Design an enzyme around this catalytic site. Structure first.
Site, mmCIF file in Angstrom:
data_model
loop_
_atom_site.group_PDB
_atom_site.id
_atom_site.type_symbol
_atom_site.label_atom_id
_atom_site.label_comp_id
_atom_site.label_asym_id
_atom_site.label_seq_id
_atom_site.Cartn_x
_atom_site.Cartn_y
_atom_site.Cartn_z
ATOM 1 N N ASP A 66 -36.197 65.328 4.095
ATOM 2 C CA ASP A 66 -35.566 65.184 5.291
ATOM 3 C C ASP A 66 -34.849 66.401 6.047
ATOM 4 O O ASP A 66 -34.082 67.122 5.270
ATOM 5 C CB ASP A 66 -34.240 64.191 5.073
ATOM 6 C CG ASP A 66 -33.675 63.938 6.360
ATOM 7 O OD1 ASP A 66 -33.769 64.048 7.484
ATOM 8 O OD2 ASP A 66 -32.395 63.579 5.783
ATOM 9 N N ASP B 260 -36.424 66.370 13.219
ATOM 10 C CA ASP B 260 -36.013 65.716 11.827
ATOM 11 C C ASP B 260 -37.078 65.090 11.416
ATOM 12 O O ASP B 260 -37.696 64.038 11.666
ATOM 13 C CB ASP B 260 -34.768 64.692 12.164
ATOM 14 C CG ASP B 260 -34.255 63.824 11.148
ATOM 15 O OD1 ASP B 260 -34.832 64.068 10.001
ATOM 16 O OD2 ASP B 260 -33.477 63.107 11.322
HETATM 17 C C1 C60 Z 1 -25.086 62.589 4.812
HETATM 18 C C2 C60 Z 1 -25.570 63.334 6.021
HETATM 19 C C3 C60 Z 1 -27.051 62.833 6.673
HETATM 20 C C4 C60 Z 1 -26.804 63.499 7.937
HETATM 21 N N1 C60 Z 1 -27.866 63.114 8.540
HETATM 22 C C5 C60 Z 1 -28.354 62.219 9.323
HETATM 23 O O1 C60 Z 1 -28.075 61.065 8.866
HETATM 24 C C6 C60 Z 1 -29.626 62.212 10.214
HETATM 25 C C7 C60 Z 1 -30.577 61.203 10.031
HETATM 26 C C8 C60 Z 1 -31.590 61.545 8.939
HETATM 27 O O2 C60 Z 1 -32.506 62.570 9.033
HETATM 28 C C9 C60 Z 1 -32.319 60.197 8.302
HETATM 29 C C10 C60 Z 1 -32.856 60.836 7.206
HETATM 30 C C11 C60 Z 1 -33.770 59.275 6.587
HETATM 31 C C12 C60 Z 1 -34.376 59.610 5.254
HETATM 32 C C13 C60 Z 1 -35.158 58.220 4.721
HETATM 33 C C14 C60 Z 1 -33.781 57.290 4.413
HETATM 34 C C15 C60 Z 1 -32.637 57.174 5.466
HETATM 35 C C16 C60 Z 1 -32.422 58.607 6.373
HETATM 36 N N2 C60 Z 1 -32.851 59.329 9.068
HETATM 37 C C17 C60 Z 1 -32.569 58.358 9.873
HETATM 38 O O3 C60 Z 1 -31.391 57.921 9.842
HETATM 39 C C18 C60 Z 1 -33.493 57.754 10.768
HETATM 40 C C19 C60 Z 1 -32.899 57.092 12.123
HETATM 41 C C20 C60 Z 1 -32.895 58.743 13.264
HETATM 42 C C21 C60 Z 1 -33.765 58.888 14.251
HETATM 43 N N3 C60 Z 1 -33.271 59.882 14.823
HETATM 44 C C22 C60 Z 1 -31.934 60.050 14.441
HETATM 45 N N4 C60 Z 1 -31.772 59.351 13.475
HETATM 46 N N5 C60 Z 1 -33.801 56.401 10.241
HETATM 47 C C23 C60 Z 1 -35.201 56.178 10.030
HETATM 48 O O4 C60 Z 1 -36.091 56.654 10.338
HETATM 49 C C24 C60 Z 1 -35.452 55.077 9.398
HETATM 50 C C25 C60 Z 1 -35.959 55.813 8.285
HETATM 51 C C26 C60 Z 1 -36.294 55.013 7.129
HETATM 52 C C27 C60 Z 1 -37.592 54.573 7.093
HETATM 53 C C28 C60 Z 1 -38.172 53.610 6.060
HETATM 54 C C29 C60 Z 1 -36.966 53.044 5.132
HETATM 55 C C30 C60 Z 1 -35.911 53.235 5.131
HETATM 56 C C31 C60 Z 1 -35.486 54.271 5.933
HETATM 57 C C32 C60 Z 1 -36.539 54.324 9.960
HETATM 58 S S1 C60 Z 1 -35.854 52.899 10.797
HETATM 59 O O5 C60 Z 1 -35.033 53.758 11.946
HETATM 60 O O6 C60 Z 1 -34.879 52.198 10.121
HETATM 61 C C33 C60 Z 1 -36.867 51.728 11.420
HETATM 62 C C34 C60 Z 1 -37.517 51.133 10.203
HETATM 63 C C35 C60 Z 1 -38.024 52.697 12.290
HETATM 64 C C36 C60 Z 1 -36.175 50.860 12.548
HETATM 65 C C37 C60 Z 1 -29.043 62.299 11.494
HETATM 66 C C38 C60 Z 1 -27.581 62.937 11.473
HETATM 67 C C39 C60 Z 1 -29.958 63.432 12.614
#
Ligand code: C60
Ligand code: C60
Ligand code: NAG
Ligand code: NAG
EC number: 3.4.23.15
Lengths: 329, 329
Positions: A34, A215
């Site tokens: 990520d 991302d």
């Molecule tokens: C601890 C500090 C972390 C800081 N960074 C973040 O949280 C970043 C988000 C980060 O890149 C995380 C990285 C993923 C890695 C996989 C497990 C969860 C997190 N991504 C997400 O939270 C993103 C949301 C997002 C989109 N645009 C901005 N944020 N989540 C997703 O894409 C989810 C990823 C996922 C997929 C399968 C199983 C579990 C999780 C998909 S989902 O949104 O829940 C969905 C199923 C499409 C509705 C933000 C700040 C940009």
């Protein structure tokens, strides 16, 4: 100098994962790489079955590694989706043929939503130390420190060999033409400036510019709530709790959308952003874009995730503090 | 005449399921009994592993039942959360010791989100024929037809023996005092009129009345987006993608909320609507209320789900077209 490739698995265009080895002898985990975060975590043996996600994913056994060196400092990681907790630990991790001694989290709390949807076991953050919870040094910085790659660059190829990440270079067999670079806006986060989101041929959003976080660990394209509302309004999409939808027969009547990054328009067409399960009416098809309010200081920003990356071969260049894009193939 | 009890399993206060038997010899499935819908469905053998949910749930084998009688008409069921498709079929189903010959759907498309979070295999709708996709006769109507229950009533007990549904009566060992009845507003849907949602001692929402659907198959309390926004604002809660949250240490500073149904105020306190995992700060606790835009004609309405039912023993009375509530114990 050195270049390693990491073969990824595409799970439904929504999860791109590869493998790393931890401990001695190595314990294998599937992780998403990520660019939106910077910590490493995997599930732990100390995770209770009173957490289902832990029953269905690979768990790391410290007692089975000779190289494990205990830390134990607590760790909580709040993501856009999902929060995980556990404690910090240290051991050797090898990814792509490169072994580093890394501080990683052993997770003991893994919620069902969203982790039971997970086909991977953990995450490897490819961000900067400024996003690192616990000021723990990111895996790539450590890699760099080892002084071994040809260059301080890493490339992502997401396919429609579901994928491929290249450490220390790019693979040209996966992109057409030259790269177009955009400089980091601020250091410590993979974010650049965007100059407009257009629908068809009209600039609807972000006209006085905005920020885009590139991302790889986000499955869809994200935008703030206010923006996605305006966008969906324009595309003619309905809001479901979990996604934006459109009647499947209308999939191909949907306008192209374009991101103005740097000096180019990067266009996705109906074919790139609709999960066209059927051309059947009365059957809702998912759009691969959704809303996400990212809090400051990093947010508000858009997030160009896998929907974007699938079309545009992405290069993350740490020597020059910039990001390059080329057409994927 | 007759009264059957159906023992339920509470999975994290969010899934209350029991068992039914289908076919001859019977094939057992765990299902949620939903007053918000009217069809019966279970997963089918004809479901592809190219659908993970089907790999992790019990699948119904028509070829193994003597009583199966093929229909095959296609069926699509769009829920607030989740859409399932398959084809119609007929066989005997026994729930609670009562066997009826029922038309049910065999599901061949079951999305991961939300089905992989599911601990149950299917759904048994306890609504009216007016909500029945395909005009297929609901299981309870068929039960009634059999002429065997003491009364045309069914009761829900959701615990904090995770639960218990009583067909044809109530179980007093699970409620204190007398029942308070509210008449159906319209027939064909379990909805009543609400006269106000109060925070602390002030009426904030639904002051000129509104509708409440009493839904056992909804884990939380629902309200339209505009309303939940106003409510959360008042409680001091933050929006996550998947839920409303509050710092866990603040859980017990949260005001009581009350639903004005009929002639009573039905109050839930912080203790009834916060998933108090910890009294620890810097640790977000989930509220068991969220937003849900239910389209007309049935919506917009609130939805009093398991969070409500857990506190108020609910009685669904089909002879008189009304709903009774008593304090659960
Ligand atoms: C601890 C500090 C972390 C800081 N960074 C973040 O949280 C970043 C988000 C980060 O890149 C995380 C990285 C993923 C890695 C996989 C497990 C969860 C997190 N991504 C997400 O939270 C993103 C949301 C997002 C989109 N645009 C901005 N944020 N989540 C997703 O894409 C989810 C990823 C996922 C997929 C399968 C199983 C579990 C999780 C998909 S989902 O949104 O829940 C969905 C199923 C499409 C509705 C933000 C700040 C940009
Ligand atoms: C085909 C005609 C159906 C017509 N009716 C409905 O869809 C009604 C909703 C209905 O009662 C269904 C019944 C359940 C039965 C379990 C499987 C999915 C559906 N409930 C939901 O859609 C409710 C949402 C709701 C709340 N208030 C109004 N709607 N969904 C939920 O509670 C979800 C139920 C669930 C739980 C575990 C695993 C899978 C699914 C929980 S959830 O909202 O996704 C969450 C995990 C708390 C975020 C609406 C109209 C009132
Ligand atoms: C864990 O490593 C961290 C590095 O931030 C250090 O402060 C802490 O003392 C270490 N814990 C132990 C038991 O060495
Ligand atoms: C299925 O039952 C439905 C009842 O609505 C009927 O219209 C249809 O003809 C039946 N299909 C077959 C093959 O009997």
């Amino acid at each position: 100098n050195t270049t390693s490739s990491v073969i990824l698995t595409n799970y439904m265009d929504t999860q791109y994962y590869g493998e790393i080895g931890i401990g001695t002898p190595p314990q294998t985990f599937k992780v998403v790489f990520d660019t939106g975060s910077s910590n490493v975590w995997v599930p732990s043996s100390k995770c209770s079955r009173l957490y289902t996600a832990c029953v269905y994913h690979k768990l790391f056994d410290a007692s089975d590694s000779s190289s494990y060196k205990h830390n134990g400092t607590e760790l909580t990681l709040r993501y856009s989706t999902g929060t995980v907790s556990g404690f910090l630990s240290q051991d050797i991790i090898t990814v792509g043929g490169i072994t580093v001694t890394q501080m990683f989290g052993e997770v003991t709390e893994m919620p069902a939503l969203p982790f039971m949807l997970a086909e991977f076991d953990g995450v490897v953050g490819m961000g900067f130390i400024e996003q690192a919870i616990g000021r723990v040094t990111p895996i790539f910085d450590n890699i760099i420190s080892q002084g071994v790659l040809k260059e301080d660059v890493f490339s992502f190829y997401y396919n429609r060999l579901g994928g491929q990440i290249v450490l220390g270079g790019s693979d040209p067999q996966h992109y057409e033409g030259n790269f177009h670079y955009i400089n980091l806006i601020k250091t410590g986060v993979w974010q650049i400036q965007m100059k407009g989101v257009s629908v068809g041929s009209s600039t609807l959003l972000c006209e006085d510019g905005c920020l885009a976080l590139v991302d790889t660990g986000a499955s869809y394209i994200s935008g703030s709530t206010s923006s996605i509302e305006k966008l969906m309004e324009a595309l003619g999409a309905k809001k479901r709790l979990f996604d934006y939808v459109v009647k499947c027969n209308e999939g191909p009547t949907l306008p192209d959308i374009s991101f103005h990054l740097g000096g180019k328009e990067y266009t996705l067409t109906s074919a790139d952003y609709v999960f066209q399960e059927s051309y059947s009416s009365k059957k809702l098809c998912t759009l691969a874009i959704h809303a996400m309010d990212i809090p400051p200081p990093t947010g508000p920003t858009w997030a160009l995730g896998a929907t974007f990356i699938r079309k545009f071969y992405t290069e993350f260049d740490r020597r020059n503090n910039r990001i390059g894009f080329a057409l994927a193939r």
